[PDB]
Structures are given as structure tokens and as C-alpha cells.
Design a protein around this nucleic acid. Sequence first.
DNA 1: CCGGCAATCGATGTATATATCTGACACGTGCCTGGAGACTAGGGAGTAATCCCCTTGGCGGTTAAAACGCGGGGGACAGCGCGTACGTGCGTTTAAGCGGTGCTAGAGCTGTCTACGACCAATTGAGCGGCCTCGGCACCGGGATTCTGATGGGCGG
DNA 2: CCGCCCATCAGAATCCCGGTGCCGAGGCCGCTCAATTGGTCGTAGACAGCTCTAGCACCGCTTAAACGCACGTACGCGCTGTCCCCCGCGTTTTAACCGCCAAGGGGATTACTCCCTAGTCTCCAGGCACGTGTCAGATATATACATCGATTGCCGG
Lengths: 83, 78, 74, 97, 97, 105, 103, 95, 93
Amino acid sequence: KVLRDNIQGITKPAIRRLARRGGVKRISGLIYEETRGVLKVFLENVIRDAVTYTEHAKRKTVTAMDVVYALKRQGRTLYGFGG
Amino acid sequence: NIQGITKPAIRRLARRGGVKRISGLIYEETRGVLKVFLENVIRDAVTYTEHAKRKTVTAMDVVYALKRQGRTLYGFGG
Amino acid sequence: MQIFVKTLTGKTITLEVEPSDTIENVKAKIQDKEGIPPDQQRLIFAGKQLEDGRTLSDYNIQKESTLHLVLRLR
Amino acid sequence: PHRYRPGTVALREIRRYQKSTELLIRKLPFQRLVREIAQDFKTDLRFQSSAVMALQEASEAYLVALFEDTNLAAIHAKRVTIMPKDIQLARRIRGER
Amino acid sequence: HRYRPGTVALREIRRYQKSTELLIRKLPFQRLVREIAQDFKTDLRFQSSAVMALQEASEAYLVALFEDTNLAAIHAKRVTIMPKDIQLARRIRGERA
Amino acid sequence: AKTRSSRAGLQFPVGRVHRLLRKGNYAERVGAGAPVYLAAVLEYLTAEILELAGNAARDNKKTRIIPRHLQLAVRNDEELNKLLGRVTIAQGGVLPNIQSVLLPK
Amino acid sequence: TRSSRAGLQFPVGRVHRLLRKGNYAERVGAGAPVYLAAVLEYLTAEILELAGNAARDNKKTRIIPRHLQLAVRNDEELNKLLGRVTIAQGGVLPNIQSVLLPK
Amino acid sequence: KTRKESYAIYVYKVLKQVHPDTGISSKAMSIMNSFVNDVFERIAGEASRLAHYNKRSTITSREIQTAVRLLLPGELAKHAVSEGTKAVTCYTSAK
Amino acid sequence: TRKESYAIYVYKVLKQVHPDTGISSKAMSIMNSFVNDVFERIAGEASRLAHYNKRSTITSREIQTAVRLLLPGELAKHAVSEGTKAVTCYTSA
DNA sequence: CCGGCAATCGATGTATATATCTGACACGTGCCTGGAGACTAGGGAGTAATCCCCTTGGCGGTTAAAACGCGGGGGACAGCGCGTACGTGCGTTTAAGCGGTGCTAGAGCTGTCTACGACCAATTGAGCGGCCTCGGCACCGGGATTCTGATGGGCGG
DNA sequence: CCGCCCATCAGAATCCCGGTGCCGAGGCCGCTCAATTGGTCGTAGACAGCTCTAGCACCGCTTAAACGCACGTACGCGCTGTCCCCCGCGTTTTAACCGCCAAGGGGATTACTCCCTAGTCTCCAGGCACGTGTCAGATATATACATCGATTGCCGG
């Protein structure tokens, strides 16, 4: 089933909590849209790489190993989910 | 010998960088950052030279060191 | 617009050919202005052998381009 | 009526969320967004739960680091509020196109 | 006559952004490199190509740093670059902790 | 002694490291002392990280080490921070840090 | 030769030899050198075409590192590919921020 | 005077194919040689890692194709994939 | 199928270091990833070093130079000392 | 007689102490696959000798760049005023999260057999090193064109 | 009547054009070593089939989080004034660059040997999968303490 409008599921309180963990006190009202765009770009890159990895293996299911390999390719090593 | 990097040279580098007005305390900072960068690269290059049992540092060692630091350089035999 | 075509003798010729015009039209204009038979002409752009069945826009030929003669790519 | 001045609860929230380790985004919306994004590259795709978990961890870490840099850029301009220009400057200096 | 401040600066910007020569004298850089190397190991020899490559890399690094510094200075509604701009650029890039 | 680790006086396995080296497409041949050297270095790094993490665990009045303690151990050491500079640790968190200009006067 | 069969300019046998003696895998297939040589030739052609155009703009008949730098820095995909590469004697792109220009 | 190999002749052939009347200097030749070598190492390493992940002992054209897709960005990957497929088909057809 | 890991050796080292502390299941996964990552880094550096000098074997000199190139300032000294001591003990016995 | 400064006081939020139960960690058991032991064959690497190439050091000149100083204009910084955008709190609405149920597509393992890659030997041409020659580009001198800033003027508050 | 905005001049600065020459790029030639060809052999991988696990879909209920609105205050932004510190230009000093010469350290090659590593076969024990008990830690509840913001008293203007 094709779903749209899911970028708005990242609500303003969630972005505020992320900013609080980042150390920010006051937030302008135009920050949420730019945050959504940045997150979308990052996710698009990572998912493209992971899907390429999955397709090479002739699998129809994306695994955590594909995500780890993609992230390592993007120069962002991640510890904990195997590897 | 760090004073051999004169102020006009730093101004020329800034001009190539697109800078119009320069504060008077910029030259000391530039000298410090250049010294740190050179120290790292030369350490790596001398390690590479010592592994090969040579008493002369070659351009290949410099290229390998720069590639290790993440700064590939074209035109010197890579 | 005006394109520059270079021959094996170093002669440079200016051609006023529309982007939508086909390569065969370019050959016909070259023959009209120079007398060289179209079948004896081999034009190249971006290191590719042009085909009479395509147009200038097919090869993405923009303004102030340069074409060369005779050279074949295969 | 009791009421705190502006900036107090903000500092309390900063202290609270800088000592915890849980994820700060709801799971169902993120899963839906990931599936929608992956629909562009290839249809009829299945995901392991671990894959979505790893994606969430990476995304949250990236965003937190970006917000730290944005706060630094905002302070450099003698401000306490973060604006989109700070995010743009941080991304440009980092090298992210 | 006399040119106003900022004119010769723009002329220099234009003329140094179209050339490709090295902007630092060779003997001082050679001396500095030799002393830095002698800090680690003594009785060391250098090829001319090694010093040339070191100079090229150093100049490229410094020019990129100055570009980032100019961006940071502009962000703070200024036209003069200051050490705080260099520190901010190095911190955001990741070299500075 | 029988096993190679006991001869070297180590805890990490020398035979397994040798097998991994010989099949990892690294070089045509592998010397005798390379597995010993690599195993010793790996054991040293593990010991350093574990000591720091155990101290962090004892600070929180805990008996077991969790990823938060590992993150606290790594981020508070200069050399470890330099080594693991581009590494994300799951369920780790961040170091508490507030800029001075944001504090009330 | 194998390049003649593949209709290429780059060498297939040399690429096969480099693959076999590079510690990449135990075995190498027959079509891998052909694929790699074709890709390398394509990339070389792209860069050289852009650099030759840049050389023609300068009224020069020979390519120098400045032309290669101008070609690479002005193309988005090429700039992305060679993002952490320094070209010797290349220079920079002319660019001045609009705030510094006189009113 | 030991023999030293390079890509100079093939690069010159390609240059004469794209621009019939244009030369090249020695420094530009060195830069081009470095570029070709760098791209070779990148693609080969990516293919080797791909083969290692899936527990294979051989490197095939599928590994090269996937490595090209992973490394090259955007339209570059599309055109490179087309060129490689055409070359492999032409090589297979001839014998 | 059997799956190999470093869990037992990490636990032995931990019991040598802190003879009463325990460890959870996610922390051991992080430790496994860390050990694997450092292994790959050092091995790749050593292989490149051997390739540069036209050698077909990897020795302890390659490992020493690799850990000198990869590890930061004060970590490298202690790592080199540990490796040298281990190699000497192995050779003598 | 009020203001700023300083010392109280209630409300709220956070950390601390005490059972309580549970699910994950630590330990014990069987077995099979990978590591250790013994031996043989061969080539990779260490070692010594030779040669010449390049790196280092020194001297002389000349000249452009660096250093120093000065006068001044423009930019950095500080204070002040205003207004609106963002934080804090409250009441209402929504969907996330949990707990089950069922079902099916696919991931994972196993046996087989076959086409593909490695290995070997002989042959031969493509590519590398060396030499020559001329034309693209560096260099120098002169005129053309373009900003730039001072000067005169005009105009409106 | 005078300060502010606008049109117009000479003077440095950059570029283009024409002649000169000169060194590097492009072409030609000989040889040797790596790529091609033809055949053999072993095994890596493709393919078919079976099993069972985990991913997807759906339904019901609780409740915490999200959302919308109001109010107020503190921060962002714009303006004004000052003051000083970087820029542009002229004079003097210095050391960088070029050219030339001389000497020797060490990098690169070659011949030879030998010892370290790979490959083979046998045997056995350590590590992995599985199962089980119990205790470190999450949960719930009550309580004590610290901080924050309003209230009020006091020295002083």
C-alpha cells in the first residue's frame, strides 16, 4: 500500500526533544521544516545504498547487515547491531 | 623558522581564499595551524621511510601519508 | 546559431543550423556551401559518430559547438 | 498561580534528555516513513525489525550532532536562538552538499 | 592620486584567484620542513619532489581553511576575519575538539 | 605447553587469528610472529576499554556494564576518543555539556 | 587481442593481470576485466572532453592542469566524485561573495 | 633502466578520439594516470568486499556492476553501466 | 550452524581486570564489533605496507608499523611494548 | 518617602530508602570441527659487492620583495528603544503501544552435476626506452580600452 | 543658504597585438617480455526441493502524548555615536633566486644461498549449542532535601 504525508509524523515535540539532547535552549519557528528536509535526504542516501546491497544478494528482505554495510560505506560506523 | 612564513605570504593566501579585510592577530593562528598540519604529515612520512630502511624521504612517502590522512594528491606519481 | 566545423586541412567553416535540424540536413547544407558529397562527410561531436537519422538536439549540441570531419569511432 | 520564568523548564529538559539513552521518536511514524522512502527504489520489499532499529539509531545520532554544531554557530553570532541560517552554515562548513 | 581602502584588496583577490603559482618562498619552507623532520629523526635527507608535494598540500589546506573562515565571518555580519572565525571553522570541521 | 596462546602467554586465540589472516585476502604468506603480535595488541586494547568501562559502572553503583558505561568510558579519554572518532555506539547517549552563555546569571 | 574483440582502447589483458595480482579474490571471471576497462575508458573520455573544451576557451591547443581543475570543479557529478582530491598546479575557481563588492 | 608501465598511450588514444586537434602536457598526463589508478583501486576494493560479504571466491561482472552503482553518483553510474554492458556483450558475441 | 565470536576471551580479560564486574548482552555485541573493526584496520594497513615494498609476506614488522601508523600517541607505545613482549615470550618458549 | 539589595517561605521537582518479583546472566554437559604435531620441498628474502646519481655544501651578484612608518577613513563595538515571536500552562483529541490471532512467502540448508577458471608450454607482437625535429608558448615592447576617484554642478530642504 | 545627490575629467591598470626564439611534445626505430592460443582437470556455483520461521495484516482497549489557544516577557533587530585600527603608499634593507662548482653518501641492481613457510596427514580437545537456577535490577511507594520565584524588611538616596 502506497503511503504519503509520513514526513509530518516527525512531530514538533520530537524535534524539540532532539534539540534538547543537543543542548539547545531557544528554537525558531522555521527549524522544523528544515530538519525534516535534512532527515529525508540522509534517509534517502542510506536506504538507496542498503537496497543496492540487498538486491545484489538476490533477497527480497532488507536485513540489518545491509544497513550496517551501507552506513560503513557512508563513513559512519555503528556498533551493536552485529558486525 | 616559522617566522619565515612572512605576513605578505599569509595575506596572499587569504587573497586567494577570497578575504578582503584581515585582523592583526590572524598570522600567529595561521602559523600554529600550519605547524600542526606539517607535524602530522611529516610524522607519517618519516614512519613510511623508516619501514623501507632508507635514509632519504621520497615523494612516494609523502603521497602515501597524505592518502592516509584522507587528502589524495594528484600529479606526483600516485 | 553558428557552429564551427574543422576539416583535415585545418579549414574552419561556420554553419547556421537550427538545433532541431537533422544531421542529414547539416550534410546537405555542407554540400550546398562546399560541394562535398554527404556520403563522403563524417561529422563527429563529443567523440561520437553522428548519424543522419538524428538531430542536433539528439546529441545535445549547444551553442558554439565544434565538429570534426572524417574521424571515425568504432 | 505558580509559574516558571522562560528558560527554566528548557534547562530542566536539557539536563533530563542529556542523561537518558532512550530513543526520542515514535516507532510507528518512523517505520512508515522508511517504508515510503524505500518504495521509490524498489516495490514489494520487506524489512527486518533490526534494520528499522539501526536506521533509527543512526538518524537520531546524526540529528543530535547537527544540532550541537548549529548551537555553536548560533552562539558565534551572539545569539541564543537557533535559526535555519545556522543549520545551513554548519552543513556547508562540514562539507555536506 | 590614491585609491580608497578595499579597491586594491579586490584587485589582489581577482589576480590571485586566476593564477596557479605557489604563494610562499621556497627556502623558508624548506628550512621549516627540515627542522620539523629533525624533531623526529636526525640525519634525514629529502628529495626535492617531497618538499614540492608538502608545499602544494599545505597551500591547498590553508586556502580551504581561509574560505571557511570567510564564510564564518560573514555569518556574524562582519567583513573582517578574526581568530574566533578560524576556531569555529576548525571546530565544526572536526579537527578541533 | 600445547596451544600457541599459552606459549605466548595470552588470552586471545593465536590459531584463530592466524586462520583469519590466511583467508582474508591480505598477502600471499603470513609469518609466525604476526598472529602473536596482533593478538597481544587486541588484548591490550580490550583491557584498556574494559578497565575504563568498569570504573564507570562502579561510579553508578552498578555491577554490570551497559552501553552507557562504554560510551562514558570512550568519550572521556583523549586517545580513545581520537581512535573511535567516527563510531556510533547504540544506546550510548551523549556527555552532559551545557554552554556557559545559556546558564542563568 | 581481447581489447579488439571488446572494441576498446584500454588494455584488457593488463587489467586482468592487475586484478589477479592485487589480492582481491581467489578467482577472477572472464568478463570482469572487460567491464572494468570499459568503465575506465568512459570516465577518461568524459574528463578529457571537458578539459579540452576548457582549453579551447583559453585559446590554447594543449591541456594543462588548470584546464583539468576547471573541468572537474564546474561539473556536479565530477565534483562529487573527486571531492577530496587535490590537483597540483590547479588553482581555484574565481568566486567573490556579494557582500564584499562595492555598493 | 627498468621498464615502467603507465596509461599514457591509451589516454592519448582516447584524447585523439574526442578532440582530434588537441595535445597534452606531461603534468596533465601524470594527473590522468593518478586518476585512472585511483578509480581502479576504488572499484576493485568495493568488488572484493562485495564478494567477501556473500561468501564467494570469484569476482565477476556482477560485482563490478554493483560496485559501480555503489560508487559512481547519479547519471555517471547509468552511463557507465550502459558502457560496461555493451562492452561485455560485444566481447561475448565475438570469438 | 556454529557462529564464532570473541565473547569468551573478552569475558576472561574482564575477569582479569575487574574480578567482580559483569557484562550485559548488548555490551558484548559492542565489544565484538570493536575487536573486529580494529582487526580489519590493522590487517589492511599491513597489507598495503607489504604491497608498497614489493613483498609477498606479512611479518611482525608490518604489524608494528601498522599499529604505529594507526594508533594515537601514547596508545602506540604501550601496544608496541605488549606486542614485542608477547613475540619474545613466544619465540623463547 | 520610595528603590535596589538582600534575606525569608511556600510549592514543585528530584534524589533516596525499602520491599518484591522477575527475566537475563552465569554455569554445567556433550560432541565435532578446527587447531596442534611431525615431516618434506622449494622459493622469498637476507647478504654482500658495485656503480653512479643525486643530494648537500659553498660562493658571488642583482634585484625584487620584505620591513618600517605614516596619515586617515571606514568598520567594529557599545548603548538604547521597541515590538513581536517564542515559552509556559491548560483543556481536549488522537493515535501509539500492547496483547493476541492467523497465515503465508521466503530465507536457509542439502544434494548433484556441470561449465568455468587455473595451470602449462610455445610463439610472437605490443609497448617501452632512446633519439631528433619543429611548432606552441613564453617573452618583450607598444598601443587600446576600462575602471576609479576627484571635480564641478545642480538641486531641494 | 548650504548639505546631498549627480554628470564629467585625467590617470593608473589590464588586455590585446605583433615579432622572436627556444625547449618540450610528438613521431620514428629496435628489442624483449608479457599476452595469446590450445589443451587438461578439478571444483565453485547454479539449480531444484523441502522446512519452518518471521514478517505482515487485523482487531480491541488504555492512556499518554500531541494539539490548539491564551498571555506575557525577553530577546532580536535597527539606529546612533565614537574611536581606533587596518589599508594604501613611499623609502630603505635584506635575503631569495640563479648560476656554477665540487664531493661523497646512498639508492638501485645483481649473484647466491638457506631457512622459513606452505602442503599433507593424523589425532584430539576446546568452543559452541543447549538447558537450568537465582539474583541484579526494574517497579512501586513513601519521604527528605534543594531550588525557584514571590514577599517583605532594611540602608540609603
